[PDB]
Design an enzyme around this catalytic site. Structure first.
Site, PDB file in Angstrom:
ATOM      1  N   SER A 437      -2.554   0.716 -10.856  1.00  0.00           N
ATOM      2  CA  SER A 437      -3.425   0.468 -12.001  1.00  0.00           C
ATOM      3  C   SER A 437      -3.179   1.506 -13.111  1.00  0.00           C
ATOM      4  O   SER A 437      -2.053   1.595 -13.610  1.00  0.00           O
ATOM      5  CB  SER A 437      -4.888   0.339 -11.542  1.00  0.00           C
ATOM      6  N   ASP A 516      -3.251 -11.008 -11.233  1.00  0.00           N
ATOM      7  CA  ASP A 516      -3.988  -9.889 -11.768  1.00  0.00           C
ATOM      8  C   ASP A 516      -4.558 -10.225 -13.158  1.00  0.00           C
ATOM      9  O   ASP A 516      -3.830 -10.608 -14.064  1.00  0.00           O
ATOM     10  CB  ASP A 516      -3.065  -8.664 -11.826  1.00  0.00           C
ATOM     11  N   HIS A 548      -5.908  -7.970  -8.765  1.00  0.00           N
ATOM     12  CA  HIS A 548      -6.038  -6.517  -8.721  1.00  0.00           C
ATOM     13  C   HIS A 548      -6.825  -5.988  -7.521  1.00  0.00           C
ATOM     14  O   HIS A 548      -6.600  -4.858  -7.068  1.00  0.00           O
ATOM     15  CB  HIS A 548      -6.726  -6.025  -9.994  1.00  0.00           C
TER      16      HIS A 548
END
EC number: 3.4.19.1
Lengths: 573, 573
Positions: A437, A516, A548
């Site tokens: 991330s 995502d 995610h």
């Protein structure tokens, strides 16, 4: 390499527990990663009862003793369009989808028993909602990411990232909506709970310290809250993790300094196992919290004995693979000291292969708290350096807010400073960077802006391009990008690593879930096209039907395995 | 699974040998995939002596007894721009680059000991070259893929894919260059060797039967060659793998029918291990060839006994994982019978999970020969189905040439018939498709044109877009694409799976080496773009610093492991 699979699998597989509340009269509501996915359970004292059917993402905060649970579950193969599912606690495994709520990104929520109250992000808004027997109501539109903290009577209290990385307190009315926003000039509100006297107790995190305040929602009057015991104020916390009123009226507070937390009831220290703790509940006249450390997967324990109620246990070989942990203070480019957790591998020499494992958020922290990535790296013969770069939580508002307007700036210098410290201090024979991330963004930024610092990098679920990502983001993420970049177009372009691919000299591994909706795949594909056209060495792994938030073992493996393989391969040269 | 990783690893790690010739007086020259990579060795009855330093791709064909070996090494991280390095056999491990030869795709070559003659493709041409004491000379420009087969005196013989999928004989003069091309109207030349009489003995593969002919290079006259012994002509080969004159003047011929070969010396059958054989050399007065089968990785053996000189032992547990094999004749859409090799896994039920594993080329075949992918599939608990779709070698000129102008047509129908055969015969409880190169093209074509036929697809190093690939291809591959497609832009577009992405309904796993220069990555990135935009499930694994030709253990693991993982995951549901 087959031993790496066994290590990664077992590290992921070990049971991990988070305390959500008390429900069904007098039973613990617990979200557990167990039997290979995230499920919700009741814990009576003996055997756990599974509440959900299919894997969940979370549950809403239950009012004490409520006879149901609200599951949050992604109904879009990882894009985080969640639906809510009600489970009556007397009938576990029977789900009623709350069809009045269209799928959206559920950010938070509480269930009073009469009303399910949540914040959610769609394309056009972040909003605070209440679902009661009358139907769904939008209580308020929020300026950005916002989170329900607590409800007592018709008073709702929450926290809002409504500008400049600052956290505001907000209130609304369960019955008639509206929004009142309370902003401190001294810092950010970090947790909130409504007292019996219908005031909002909140942690306030200022420049380099944290304290408790009372906010009256009628006028905006803020006082300092003083407790009967003075252990809390003497502890001198830097951050408040959580607080909440128990049903007996006592205020429980988890606060922390330097990556470990302490528990307080009405100001008084309650002894707890070393590491970090989560919410504190009253259950059968005993205090119960969650506990974790760098060596201990999240578990449920009773205080003050620290005796485990629910814990997964790691195999002895994997426990040993972590030689030790320590907090060090690495001097950075402006003389600031970057608080950096170091996980020493008992499977590497010193100096030895060392990974700078960069945390996400960026409003997050490397604490003395379990980290599966870090653990798998230690299992695979790497030391792990985990720097709390500016932007991090846990070390004051000032340190946290320094990242605002400056992504791929000072925070990267802090990450680079930790790297150079790992070499200069004699810990590392060679250096890698890895991150998920915002961490993956840091990998890309390090390899583009600091070529030759690292031997190789892993960039998982990365920010790649602030600009294209903005175009594909929902209302919450658009706002958060605005905040992080200061609304600067120049920052969004110049700080996007996709615009500096020619500078890359080191092998790069990209890992990205295809659905995502936070850090979208689309800019990652463009990055791969740039790496290709410019003759750069790269590896890529795109995970199917995932986004995610990983909530199964097999997706956890798909995300982590290739990263460990890649680095292990690099260590051969 | 870690057990899958271990089996996959061990299957890749088993040493595999090819016989190249006799050098350094009377020592066998072999290329072995050994100690983790492709290398060259001398063998003289005991331990091998490694000739190269770093991994190679191949060696040029040595004239008997020459005191050096010419290594061919990729110097572009997999893009198959090769340089040539000579190693004096008396000084193993000391390489001298032949700097007169700039990197190019080396297609073939022979070393007389005084001249290195080879074919290579650059961006602008395919050409026949000679390097001798006076430097590098281009002897001739070839229309497309061409391979040097043999040199005797001043005469050079080779095989050219110079149009329509047909293979021509060509000759040149070492001293003066030039090109003479000989076509047969009955078929294609498959093998060539110059006789003492300075004519070209060649294998001619026709409609069904193959035969030996003598081509007089002075006038183009062709007559049948009759040999002293009639075992060869009475064997009635459909294909001729290889032929060559031995030092004593005898003509060694390796020919085959139905996926298995036989060895002949002056027409007399020489007993040999069941399976397939490569070249035959005279070493210390006796016969030596390579041997492979579905259950035996390529090895070097003595004839007629079959005693191994160099053999990577297939461990018993892995051997046992193949419970059986069969040659079946699948009925295709048009009544054609598709010779199809089948492996039953000892680790799956019947009916059970079955993979149609599609061969590359397309001018190749599934034969009774070692296939690492098939073996790993069997080890992982999948039956394997390996159809010789039209385009395949081994079954005559008519069958092989049917594919011309019709990619993603009749051949895909053959593949689909094999899927149907697997289900209807009772072998397959569920079906997957997997393939590398032209095989990966077939995966993509099956998921786009035959949605619902397979449960899931693995496409490795795939052809994705004929047109874009053509524009990215060197002279050899541009010519080959023209031949395969007919040159029609409508065939190039309509038969490209990237133009049919909408129809995809099954999970797809893409695997691709980043520097592949036969099947480039660029169109695959675009395919991923299309899959993303159209909400299709897929995964992707791009492997670093690697191309189409896999020459290390760890690269073969990165190519094969994701596929087996993906199929194993798919089988859980």
């Amino acid at each position: 390499f087959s031993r790496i699979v066994r290590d990664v699998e077992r590290l992921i597989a070990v049971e991990k527990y988070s305390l959500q509340g008390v429900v069904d009269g007098d039973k613990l509501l617990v979200v557990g990663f167990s039997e290979g996915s995230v499920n919700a359970y009741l814990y009576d004292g003996g055997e756990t009862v599974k509440l959900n059917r299919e894997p969940i993402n979370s549950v809403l905060d239950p009012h004490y003793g409520v006879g149901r649970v609200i599951l949050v579950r992604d109904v879009s193969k990882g894009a985080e369009q969640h639906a809510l599912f009600k489970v009556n606690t007397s009938r576990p495994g029977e789900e009623q989808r709350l069809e009045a709520v269209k799928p959206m990104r559920i950010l938070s929520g509480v269930d009073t028993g009469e009303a399910v109250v949540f914040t959610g992000a769609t394309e056009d808004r972040v909003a605070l909602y209440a679902l009661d027997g009358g139907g769904l109501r939008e209580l308020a539109r929020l300026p950005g990411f916002g989170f329900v903290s607590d409800i007592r009577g018709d008073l709702i209290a929450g926290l809002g990232f409504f500008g400049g990385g600052r956290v505001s307190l907000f209130t609304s009315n369960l019955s008639s909506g509206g929004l009142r926003v309370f902003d401190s000039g001294e810092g950010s509100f970090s947790s909130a709970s409504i007292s019996p006297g219908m005031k909002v107790t909140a942690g306030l995190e200022t420049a380099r310290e944290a304290r408790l305040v009372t906010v009256d929602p009628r006028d905006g009057s803020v006082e300092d809250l003083e407790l009967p015991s003075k252990d809390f104020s003497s502890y001198r916390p830097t951050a408040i993790t959580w607080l909440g009123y128990l049903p007996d009226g006592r205020l429980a507070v988890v606060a922390r300094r330097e990556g470990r937390s302490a528990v307080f009831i009405d100001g008084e220290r309650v002894e707890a196992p070393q590491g970090n703790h989560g919410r504190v509940v009253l259950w059968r006249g005993k205090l119960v919290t969650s506990h974790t450390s760098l060596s201990t997967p999240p578990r449920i324990v009773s205080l003050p004995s620290g005796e485990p109620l629910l814990e997964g246990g790691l195999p002895e070989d994997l426990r040993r693979s972590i030689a030790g942990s320590r907090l060090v203070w690495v001097e950075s480019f402006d003389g600031s000291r970057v608080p950096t957790y170091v996980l020493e591998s008992g499977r590497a020499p010193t100096p030895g292969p060392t990974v700078v494992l960069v945390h996400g958020g960026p409003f997050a922290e490397d604490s003395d708290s379990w980290d599966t990535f870090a653990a798998s790296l230690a299992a695979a013969g790497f030391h792990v350096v985990m720097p709390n770069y500016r932007g991090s939580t846990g070390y004051g508002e000032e340190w946290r807010l320094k990242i605002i307007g400056d992504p791929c700036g000072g925070e990267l210098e802090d990450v680079s400073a930790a790297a150079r410290w790992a070499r200069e201090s004699g810990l590392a024979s060679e250096l890698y960077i890895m991150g998920y991330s915002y961490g993956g963004y840091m990998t890309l930024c390090a390899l583009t802006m600091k070529p030759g610092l690292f031997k190789a990098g892993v960039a998982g679920a990365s920010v790649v391009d602030w600009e294209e990502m903005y175009e594909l983001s929902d209302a919450a993420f658009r706002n958060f990008i605005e905040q992080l970049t200061g609304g600067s177009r120049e920052i969004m372009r110049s700080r996007s690593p996709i615009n500096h691919v020619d500078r890359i000299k080191e092998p790069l591994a990209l890992i990205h879930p295809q659905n995502d909706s936070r850090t979208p795949l689309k800019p990652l594909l463009r990055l791969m096209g740039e790496l290709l056209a410019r003759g750069k060495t790269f590896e890529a792994h795109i995970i199917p039907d995932a986004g995610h938030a990983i909530n199964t073992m097999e997706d956890a493996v798909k995300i982590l395995l290739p990263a460990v393989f890649f680095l292990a391969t690099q260590r051969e040269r």
